[PDB]
Write a protein that binds this ligand. Sequence first.
Ligand SMILES: Nc1ncnc2c1ncn2[C@@H]1O[C@H](COP(=O)(O)OP(=O)(O)NP(=O)(O)O)[C@@H](O)[C@H]1O
Ligand SMILES: OC[C@H]1O[C@@H](O)[C@H](O)[C@@H](O)[C@@H]1O
Length: 378
Amino acid sequence: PLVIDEDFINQVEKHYRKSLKNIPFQYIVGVDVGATNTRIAIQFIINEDQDDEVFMTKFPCNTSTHLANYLAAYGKAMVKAVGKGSAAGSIALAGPVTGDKVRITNYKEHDQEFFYSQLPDTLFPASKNTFLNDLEASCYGIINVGTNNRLHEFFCPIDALNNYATSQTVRLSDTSEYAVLAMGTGLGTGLIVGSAGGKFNVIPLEAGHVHIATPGVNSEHFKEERERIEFLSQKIYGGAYPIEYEDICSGRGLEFCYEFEIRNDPNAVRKTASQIAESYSTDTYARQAMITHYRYLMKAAQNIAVLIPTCRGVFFAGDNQVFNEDFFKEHLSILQKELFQTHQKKHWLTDLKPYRQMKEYNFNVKGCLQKARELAQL
Ligand SMILES: Nc1ncnc2c1ncn2[C@@H]1O[C@H](COP(=O)(O)OP(=O)(O)NP(=O)(O)O)[C@@H](O)[C@H]1O
Ligand SMILES: OC[C@H]1O[C@@H](O)[C@H](O)[C@@H](O)[C@@H]1O
């Protein structure tokens, strides 16, 4: 009763039939589990270690049970299509990885725990798999693009008026550390950490779930900032808890911000995150909600840069960042001031280099496939 993507499976079978019946081959698996959709990538390998074709599909999923069932079904279809299981598999999930489980933060709350044991061995063979956080996987994808000297094709300095970037102005130094943040359904955060010798490690973070502090009592917009922080505590938690960065820096958080802006307008109607991002030019409430949404993204990055004294750069990543580039560039001055000026430790941040993604790319799946490639020991 689980519908396999027919186009995907026919492509895999057609490729097996035309190209793989009489040569040695393997395949590695990369799975990108977001809060509302999961992507599966199959990368074939021939000639011991050469990339062959990659095939991808995606399905709606927001419970752990459904995710386990879909992965089991895709494992059986793959074995049926090409005659054997994968050589290695990597899965990245939108939650904190603690040992042998992940709690997928924005899956339905009654069924968000996914365990290592729910991986099908057909796609994740024993001792040949990794359990990753989604933003952690993006970091490995970013490292890998950096190694291939293409980081400046996907990111530019936030103040690049014409998106100009070079291998000199956008690069990863193996003696530096970088924060990565990506606003989507949730606020993903992580650290890329260099080691002399060109090696990079990734530190997973859950900074999207630390509490937002209120600005100083004599700061310019104190009254409104505090009013919003209290309004949202009431709305999201009944006031039992204060808000996290993700309660503003997310799709649902953008919608909450808009509802705050329109709260005293009896004629205003709430808008979805998409409608807000599309209509900020003609709807001043949407502009203000967008400004708030991205201002607190800057504060989240500022919080990490104060927390991590060796943090030298920050990458604002994700497809949403690319989609909102016009808004971001039009309000650059406001967002730089938020990042660099609104902390008494601003002199610690003077040299922080911020970058924004300027081309769509699935760094998650890229990180997964590279991790699986290493595990496969080709
Ligand atoms: N331009 C936009 N700006 C901000 N948020 C947006 C925008 N468009 C959509 N959203 C919201 O952002 C979320 C989707 O972000 P996206 O990057 O596509 O996915 P994700 O968080 O990485 N994972 P997934 O839920 O599986 O798609 C939803 O909550 C949308 O309502
Ligand atoms: O998807 C972005 C982020 O969403 C958050 O709610 C999760 O807790 C993180 O683990 C994830 O990286």
